[PDB]
Amino acid sequence: RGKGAYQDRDKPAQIRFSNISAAKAVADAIRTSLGPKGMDKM
Amino acid sequence: ASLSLAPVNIFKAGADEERAETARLTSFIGAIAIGDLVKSTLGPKGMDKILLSSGRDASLMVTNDGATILKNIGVDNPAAKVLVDMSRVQDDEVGDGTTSVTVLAAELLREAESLIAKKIHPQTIIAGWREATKAAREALLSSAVDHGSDEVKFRQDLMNIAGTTLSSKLLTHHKDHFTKLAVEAVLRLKGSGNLEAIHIIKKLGGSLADSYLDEGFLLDKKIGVNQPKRIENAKILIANTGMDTDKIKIFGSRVRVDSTAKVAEIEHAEKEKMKEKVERILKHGINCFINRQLIYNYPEQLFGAAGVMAIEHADFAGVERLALVTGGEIASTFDHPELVKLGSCKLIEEVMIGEDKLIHFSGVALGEACTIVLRGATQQILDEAERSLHDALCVLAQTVKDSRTVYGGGCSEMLMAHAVTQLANRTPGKEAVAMESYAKALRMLPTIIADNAGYDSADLVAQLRAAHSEGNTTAGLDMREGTIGDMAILGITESFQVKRQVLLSAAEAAEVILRVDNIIKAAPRKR
Amino acid sequence: PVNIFKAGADEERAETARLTSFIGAIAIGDLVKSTLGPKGMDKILLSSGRDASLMVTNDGATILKNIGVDNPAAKVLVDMSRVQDDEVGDGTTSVTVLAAELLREAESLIAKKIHPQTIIAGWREATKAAREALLSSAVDHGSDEVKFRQDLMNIAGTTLSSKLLTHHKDHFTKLAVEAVLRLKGSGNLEAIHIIKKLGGSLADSYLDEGFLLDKKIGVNQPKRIENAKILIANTGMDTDKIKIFGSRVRVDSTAKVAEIEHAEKEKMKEKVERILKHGINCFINRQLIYNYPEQLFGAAGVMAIEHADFAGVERLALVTGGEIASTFDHPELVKLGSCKLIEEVMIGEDKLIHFSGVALGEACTIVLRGATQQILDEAERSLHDALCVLAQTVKDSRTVYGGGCSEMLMAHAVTQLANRTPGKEAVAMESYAKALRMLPTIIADNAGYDSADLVAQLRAAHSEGNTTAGLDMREGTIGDMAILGITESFQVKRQVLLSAAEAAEVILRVDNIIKAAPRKR
Amino acid sequence: GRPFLIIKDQDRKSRLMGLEALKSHIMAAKAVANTMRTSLGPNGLDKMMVDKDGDVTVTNDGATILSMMDVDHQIAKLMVELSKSQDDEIGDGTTGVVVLAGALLEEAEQLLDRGIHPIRIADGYEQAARVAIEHLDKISDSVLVDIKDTEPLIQTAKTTLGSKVVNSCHRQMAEIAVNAVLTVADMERRDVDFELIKVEGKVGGRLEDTKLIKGVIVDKDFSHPQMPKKVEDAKIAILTCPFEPPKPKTKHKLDVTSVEDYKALQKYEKEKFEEMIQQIKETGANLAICQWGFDDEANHLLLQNNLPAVRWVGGPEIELIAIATGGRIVPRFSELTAEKLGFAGLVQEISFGTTKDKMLVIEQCKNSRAVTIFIRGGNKMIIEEAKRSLHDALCVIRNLIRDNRVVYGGGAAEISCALAVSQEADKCPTLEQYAMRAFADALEVIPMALSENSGMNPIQTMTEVRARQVKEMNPALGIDCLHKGTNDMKQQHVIETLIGKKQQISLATQMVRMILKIDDIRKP
Amino acid sequence: GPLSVFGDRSTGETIRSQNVMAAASIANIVKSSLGPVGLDKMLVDDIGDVTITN
């Protein structure tokens, strides 16, 4: 393809991965909240 | 993907890391700090600084060359340590251009950070600089010229290079008084290294003009009473023997007697054993003596009974120098009074040097090792004088080793820039901009030289690019004034080997430091 | 050689001061350079002492609004962005990044020991020439309705590229256009109403054919009215205190007090009948009202609306054809507001009163049924910016070319000037021109294209004289926006360049930063 | 019942158990694997780091990087241990195996959130490693290496130096390494001990100076610096005792009851000295190789005897001199004879010019057994980098002592093994296809990170290369390692070890199977 | 972690077991005040008020 933009910027990758990882964390935390047999939280 | 901090603490106290452009920023900030710390001193009109310690008598030493500067300072970023180490390596190799290689590396990294800010694959830059440096090496060797076919021209080139070195440091202020003198010293080398064979003596006071190289040899010790006070045409034998206690090689021996008369007998026996040893040595019939170890009181009295000159304990370097200059031997066995060669000299006598005493050794057999007398207004002057002259001696020895030289500073640089530019014309694709950035990086050096001089830079660089583009490969910046002139007549000859080595080392260090991707500091070793 | 400052008072009178200013400026520039072009990505302003208040924004105005600094130059640029956003809208990003590039040029120039006044004069002349050239290229329209409408569509569509709402550009840009049509050539900005109602989609939003009100109604008011004769009032109606004071009730029996109460009830009824003499089917009260007036109005049976808003009543007086009254002796000297139907509407989970078939439609009401409060806030910011741009382009009909077209035009003009200029200034101006070249470059960087190739092609095209050449952001090619439809406001770019010029002028002429000793905190 | 102290000091007592412990494991391990990404195999960068005492050391020899870290979590220390194991086994893929492990545990954490016991994942990984190694052994090609042909080995080392800065010269090192291995190898035993090679380096010079010396280097100068400096072909002797008179290793008290005893001892001292001189001069050996130093009398006597010698020479260097010279060890002059002497090719003194070091080399005309490698470069960082790189190269050659020790690498092996794993896994019942497919994905992780490190557009690169190597089957179609097109690896010829990749696969599979099991945790 | 910082969390039958913990606890105290026949328990306030209850 030839040389070009090396994408020397990857901090936005760290922020995006951090946010999405936190999102899976918070979503996983309450995965026991719904269902006709679901459990609840106090 | 790049993420090593969000999940959990994978580090103990004081342990961190930085993956993204932050690491590059840190390294480049350190590198530019190094460069400005050093680029403010490069060039024949380069500048000077002062290194001051933190407490503890505040060690003071003046220096122009940046080697000791990077040694003393506490560099923090790993790239900074890498730079100070490349500086120490270039310093040990030859010297007088360590500053140059440091500045060149820093400036290369400046264009490197710029181009990576233009989002470029580092491997491409590395390959481009490798090919460009190979081509530049070939061109510069093609420009290398051999000499030494005669004496007058070669000697003139030696004074030229000596004075050129003296420009980079402070010695320029009296460089003439140094130059020819220095030449003579390198003449006495006659095909051997170990500058330690060259001796340098400093005493506060006098003047730089008062400094001179001895027309003979010098020694700094003291002599006994029963020894004479003035001698000539001495015959010299060197020794490294134990004559203080006559310690017998067997340990465990002990006297088991009862009457103290036997003790007097055995002590007289020991004294006569020492007397017979002195007879064994004196059987060689030497006129002067040196022993590497201590001359004890009984040996000294026996020598005084003989009444000849004997020199007490000294070092290894002194005895080696004396063996060189007089052609004696360091003897530790004396059953062969005629199977040894005696050192030769013509006059040995003290000279009251101001507030000091030094013995004058004229008419020595071999004029190989030499003693240099230094005097100055401050001891810092003496320290930097010795440093700079050691650098000059290293360069002189290196150019005696190989007589391949090139034209003066920048001009060889600028023609290499011209050749690399011509390749840039031949260079297609993306590597072309990297290697032309390499080229202007090289071209930056004479600009900094002009800035250190105190003259306009852009006009000189553009005009001299025009001059070197027309084939006038001998013109260049004038050393006397901010003008342009041929250094062949001006007399600026540049040692090809030293700066080809400088270019190679700078290229290697730059590519190594550019190959980085990640800085991870470990713990600070909690106290 | 002697200390002269107070504890905490600092003065840097060397290049370290400009160094600090420049690094702060660069820290400003890179933070916002990701919010430009059609490829921008939004940012977060996270708080910890503000009780965890966050706002997401793309136009860097709010970004510079919510961040302070000790380096005074960065605050200077923050105020510059304030000014820029005070003028029209988006371009704060543009002017700030441009200032960053020009100060980087200044860095490179100071790297050659040059007295800055030469730079100052050269940039003065370059700016004069560039403004003259751009004015000579000022393309104008409005002589035709279709041409002017399409120019507005092009400007709006190009502007929505810089923000999020592009996803439904055809459902947004065009809509915004009609809003400024409703201004009827009036210079007012404060007629458009901004409404945020979380829930629903940005495509579920719409522009109603009327007006809406969000205030409680009286105790007994009809729910729907037709052909409403509308009046707007601002008086007491709260047992209508006499406004006279230093007067006291001082009697010896309470029968007189009873008669006074009966008399005040009668006087309030008299005020009500005074109002009713004019004859209306809908009443408006900017403020509250009391139970007895409410009973009187219910006896009348009309619509009384209570506790309205000053700006809103001004807007509605502009809209429905009436004006606010406070005295009612003249059933003959007042113009009455008019509407077709006034009904009830339930939007989100909030209750609104709907004006349908209003006699006029000057003011505007934009309901946003978005999906989050933060997206709603940034949507309202973006529409505010877009309507400001629309109003400005309606004001002055002259337009210009974006995609770097006008930018490389001035770049090449300055190039030729520097070529015909001797001295350092030329290359400085050339570098200045190079500085301008960085602006479209960063745009391509937002796209991540073959940067140098594109820049070379644009410079070649502008040297050839193709004065409509631009960058295709749909694919990464070079084309003509006259085909594509990428047009912007002449006023916008003109003031962007002029403000950037004067900001550079003031910033470069600094020599010593002195931070006073902090008071305390 | 009121809570009561059952466990000693439950106050400072921290317990984790269950799926959350696995979450902590996976997150830490993914962070580490992504930390160690950008040095993959034939092409990459180098990570620089400083340790506690302030030493700069940079390389892609990943084991060193992981070793010199003051890490906190246990799994990372386990990773460091695995890296050290793989380095001491082969010396390449020091980051490849850890990135593979990270990929495997990525797959494990994905499938974990699907609600399956870790035993299933470990079993799937084990079966997939079985299949992968089996096919990797089916695909490797035997290399017929003899004592006169070296070009395949030269290209092997040349490719191995990829991503390792020593690829500057990239040619001479392969030749000198092959020559050293041939000289020192024990062919019948197939054994090469690296204690026979004095891997040395000195700063300065250039990487062009990287040379192999068919002999020994010694770092001690003349006992008599005035003595003549260089000798051609010579005969040496190795004496393990000084020149001092023989005193026993038992405490001895030699009485002296008479003056004539004093005369007898002062005569016997010298008599022993010159007796030793006559003994050593009779045997005719030019050189003496001692260990403990001696007295100046011997120095001056040898000056009058013109017989060179050295002193204080250390143990291992003494042994290496003896090995190279072909002689035997002479404890004392009783064993001294003309037979056991060692013949010298030529011996010379250098000082590296500007330096004040002194260093003697021994180059042998006759057959030698212990060779020496010298390095010239930019700094101690350069010296250590060259040392570790060439040492890993020697490990590679020692592995390569046998045939079929090479398969096409550069990532192509990863595509091939991933394809084989997918093909085998597809024809299986359920509950296993998921784990096996996960292993397959972990397999093509390596080419993805490879293309990333090269800076190539990754996903299209892997797609096109996979299509090319699927439609026509060959072990040589890997992605561009020299980045110049010609992805057919029968042209670039990435020539790297078989057992290296096999051991990396085995280590990663066993290690992930191990880590999958730690489900309940306890810290203070 | 789960992004529930500045606090504490628990789960499993353990906490369900701990749900027994307090409850069964409060049983034992009152375990001598049952129906027809029981024994009274003594309470002393911080002020020291003397109080009895059954």
Short mmCIF file of N, CA and C in Angstrom, two decimals, chain B residues 7-53:
data_model
loop_
_atom_site.label_atom_id
_atom_site.label_comp_id
_atom_site.label_asym_id
_atom_site.label_seq_id
_atom_site.Cartn_x
_atom_site.Cartn_y
_atom_site.Cartn_z
N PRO B 7 -7.41 -1.96 33.92
CA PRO B 7 -7.98 -3.12 34.62
C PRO B 7 -7.72 -3.14 36.12
N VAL B 8 -6.45 -3.15 36.49
CA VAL B 8 -6.06 -3.32 37.89
C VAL B 8 -4.67 -2.72 38.07
N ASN B 9 -4.26 -2.55 39.32
CA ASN B 9 -2.91 -2.09 39.63
C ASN B 9 -1.94 -3.24 39.43
N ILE B 10 -1.23 -3.24 38.30
CA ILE B 10 -0.21 -4.24 38.02
C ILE B 10 1.17 -3.75 38.44
N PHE B 11 1.25 -2.69 39.24
CA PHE B 11 2.51 -2.12 39.66
C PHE B 11 2.53 -1.94 41.17
N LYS B 12 3.71 -2.10 41.75
CA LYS B 12 3.92 -1.75 43.15
C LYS B 12 4.12 -0.24 43.26
N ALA B 13 4.52 0.23 44.43
CA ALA B 13 4.71 1.66 44.63
C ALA B 13 5.83 2.17 43.73
N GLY B 14 5.60 3.33 43.13
CA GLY B 14 6.61 3.98 42.32
C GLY B 14 6.88 3.33 40.98
N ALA B 15 6.05 2.40 40.54
CA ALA B 15 6.21 1.75 39.25
C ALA B 15 5.11 2.22 38.31
N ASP B 16 5.50 2.66 37.12
CA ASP B 16 4.57 3.26 36.17
C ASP B 16 4.97 2.86 34.76
N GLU B 17 4.21 3.35 33.78
CA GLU B 17 4.52 3.12 32.38
C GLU B 17 3.75 4.12 31.54
N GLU B 18 4.19 4.30 30.30
CA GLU B 18 3.55 5.20 29.35
C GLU B 18 3.73 4.64 27.94
N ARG B 19 2.62 4.35 27.27
CA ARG B 19 2.64 3.66 25.99
C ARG B 19 2.55 4.60 24.80
N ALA B 20 1.65 5.56 24.83
CA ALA B 20 1.31 6.37 23.67
C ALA B 20 2.37 7.44 23.46
N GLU B 21 2.04 8.43 22.62
CA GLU B 21 2.95 9.52 22.30
C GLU B 21 3.51 10.21 23.53
N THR B 22 2.95 9.95 24.71
CA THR B 22 3.49 10.53 25.94
C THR B 22 4.94 10.10 26.15
N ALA B 23 5.22 8.81 25.92
CA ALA B 23 6.59 8.33 26.07
C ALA B 23 7.52 9.03 25.09
N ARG B 24 7.08 9.17 23.84
CA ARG B 24 7.88 9.87 22.85
C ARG B 24 8.13 11.31 23.26
N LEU B 25 7.09 11.98 23.77
CA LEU B 25 7.24 13.35 24.23
C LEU B 25 8.27 13.45 25.34
N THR B 26 8.20 12.55 26.31
CA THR B 26 9.15 12.58 27.42
C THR B 26 10.58 12.41 26.90
N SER B 27 10.78 11.39 26.07
CA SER B 27 12.12 11.12 25.55
C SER B 27 12.64 12.30 24.74
N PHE B 28 11.79 12.88 23.90
CA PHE B 28 12.22 13.98 23.05
C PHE B 28 12.44 15.25 23.84
N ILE B 29 11.66 15.48 24.89
CA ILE B 29 11.91 16.63 25.75
C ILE B 29 13.27 16.49 26.41
N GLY B 30 13.58 15.30 26.92
CA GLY B 30 14.90 15.07 27.46
C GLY B 30 15.99 15.28 26.44
N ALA B 31 15.79 14.77 25.22
CA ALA B 31 16.80 14.89 24.18
C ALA B 31 17.03 16.34 23.78
N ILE B 32 15.96 17.11 23.62
CA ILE B 32 16.10 18.52 23.25
C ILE B 32 16.73 19.30 24.39
N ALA B 33 16.40 18.93 25.63
CA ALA B 33 17.08 19.53 26.77
C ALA B 33 18.58 19.28 26.69
N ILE B 34 18.96 18.05 26.36
CA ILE B 34 20.38 17.73 26.18
C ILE B 34 20.97 18.59 25.08
N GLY B 35 20.28 18.67 23.95
CA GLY B 35 20.82 19.40 22.81
C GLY B 35 21.05 20.86 23.12
N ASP B 36 20.04 21.53 23.68
CA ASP B 36 20.20 22.94 24.03
C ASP B 36 21.26 23.10 25.11
N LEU B 37 21.37 22.12 26.01
CA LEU B 37 22.43 22.14 27.00
C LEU B 37 23.80 22.02 26.35
N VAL B 38 23.88 21.44 25.15
CA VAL B 38 25.14 21.20 24.48
C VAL B 38 25.29 22.03 23.21
N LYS B 39 24.20 22.27 22.48
CA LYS B 39 24.31 23.06 21.25
C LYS B 39 24.67 24.51 21.53
N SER B 40 24.52 24.97 22.76
CA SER B 40 24.96 26.30 23.11
C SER B 40 26.45 26.39 23.26
N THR B 41 27.21 25.36 22.87
CA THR B 41 28.66 25.38 23.02
C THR B 41 29.43 24.84 21.82
N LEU B 42 28.78 24.41 20.75
CA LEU B 42 29.48 23.78 19.64
C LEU B 42 30.03 24.81 18.66
N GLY B 43 31.10 24.42 17.97
CA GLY B 43 31.71 25.25 16.96
C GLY B 43 33.06 25.79 17.38
N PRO B 44 33.89 26.18 16.41
CA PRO B 44 35.16 26.85 16.75
C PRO B 44 34.95 28.13 17.53
N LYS B 45 33.80 28.78 17.37
CA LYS B 45 33.37 29.84 18.26
C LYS B 45 32.27 29.33 19.18
N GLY B 46 32.38 28.08 19.61
CA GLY B 46 31.48 27.53 20.60
C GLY B 46 31.69 28.20 21.94
N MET B 47 30.84 27.85 22.89
CA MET B 47 30.74 28.64 24.10
C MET B 47 31.22 27.76 25.26
N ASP B 48 31.16 28.27 26.49
CA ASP B 48 31.61 27.51 27.64
C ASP B 48 30.62 27.65 28.79
N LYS B 49 30.68 26.68 29.71
CA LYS B 49 29.75 26.58 30.83
C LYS B 49 30.53 26.31 32.11
N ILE B 50 29.80 26.20 33.22
CA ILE B 50 30.38 25.89 34.53
C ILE B 50 29.56 24.78 35.17
N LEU B 51 30.25 23.76 35.68
CA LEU B 51 29.61 22.64 36.37
C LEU B 51 29.82 22.79 37.87
N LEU B 52 28.72 22.81 38.62
CA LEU B 52 28.77 23.03 40.06
C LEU B 52 28.08 21.87 40.77
N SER B 53 28.76 21.32 41.77
CA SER B 53 28.21 20.22 42.55
C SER B 53 27.20 20.73 43.58
#
